[PDB]
Design a protein around this ligand. Sequence first.
Ligand SMILES: CC(=O)N[C@@H]1[C@@H](O)[C@H](O)[C@@H](CO)O[C@H]1O
Ligand SMILES: CC(=O)N[C@@H]1[C@@H](O)[C@H](O)[C@@H](CO)O[C@H]1O
Ligand SMILES: C[C@@H](O)CO[C@@H](C)CO[C@@H](C)CO
Lengths: 146, 146
Amino acid sequence: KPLEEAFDWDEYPVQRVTATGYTAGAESTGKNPGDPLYGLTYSGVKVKRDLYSTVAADPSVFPIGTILFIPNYGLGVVADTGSAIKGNRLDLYFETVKDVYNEWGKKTLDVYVIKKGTGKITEDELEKLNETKSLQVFRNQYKTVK
Amino acid sequence: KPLEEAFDWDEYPVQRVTATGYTAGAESTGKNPGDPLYGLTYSGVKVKRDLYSTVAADPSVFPIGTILFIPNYGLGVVADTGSAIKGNRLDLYFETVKDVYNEWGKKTLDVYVIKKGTGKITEDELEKLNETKSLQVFRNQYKTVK
Ligand SMILES: CC(=O)N[C@@H]1[C@@H](O)[C@H](O)[C@@H](CO)O[C@H]1O
Ligand SMILES: CC(=O)N[C@@H]1[C@@H](O)[C@H](O)[C@@H](CO)O[C@H]1O
Ligand SMILES: C[C@@H](O)CO[C@@H](C)CO[C@@H](C)CO
């Protein structure tokens, strides 16, 4: 039986947060494996994924040592910080980048099938779709470059 | 308007899928910058985040060239494949790992505050938490090692 179902968690105080995953790797921490500080959180404990996992928070909201229950992740102990983790934000530790993508990022949803493909697509065809005139009004919401 | 609001998308066929994000990088693709095929999808087109972005699918479900609308991502053209991308699965291209974490992975949710911290946590404390006797029954769901 899941821990989510094993207690009446709504008896505890609740905080709405925005949560992402992170790993010890350089994408997240700037550190490389081989650095003696690799895996070391702000609190001084090493990152861990277990029954109680290390998470990052803003210590002004959740002090270091705070225990949280995060549905679909598990029990967390606030052990780390981050420059983007301010306010009602959490970063949940996962061992690998793929684990973040798969265990936190995977979402079931409906998508709409606009046109079935033929089995091939060219650069020119992709460019022409991107230049669709009637849709240019929407486009700057999707490009990364200003 | 958001594109999500601009058209009656429910007039199109719909498919329920499970979707994740990916990048061109090695964690997703096994390739590194400098590799001849770096940034190139199965179809041969370069990865792209734009009005119409390149996505990965199982060609048995969505042939290459299929146009999709994916809420909270955008229009997609099926251009890529992947080893785990089987059945009703999509992988959505993002330029960077952080963009996957932040633009696909970020979830707003309620978390439960079990115990406010004191400002410190030690390895021994974390170990004690993880050894909690009454919670051992749940613990194997959170460890990666069998
Ligand atoms: C696991 C890890 O390296 N965590 C680091 C932590 O050491 C540092 O104090 C904090 C500063 O914001 O940035 C985190 O990414
Ligand atoms: C952008 C990118 O490199 N995509 C690759 C693609 O080249 C390869 O054909 C396919 C095999 O499943 O794996 C994808 O990750
Ligand atoms: C953007 C990143 O995926 C790098 O892309 C490789 C294919 C280099 O792109 C070509 C357009 C260089 O002429």
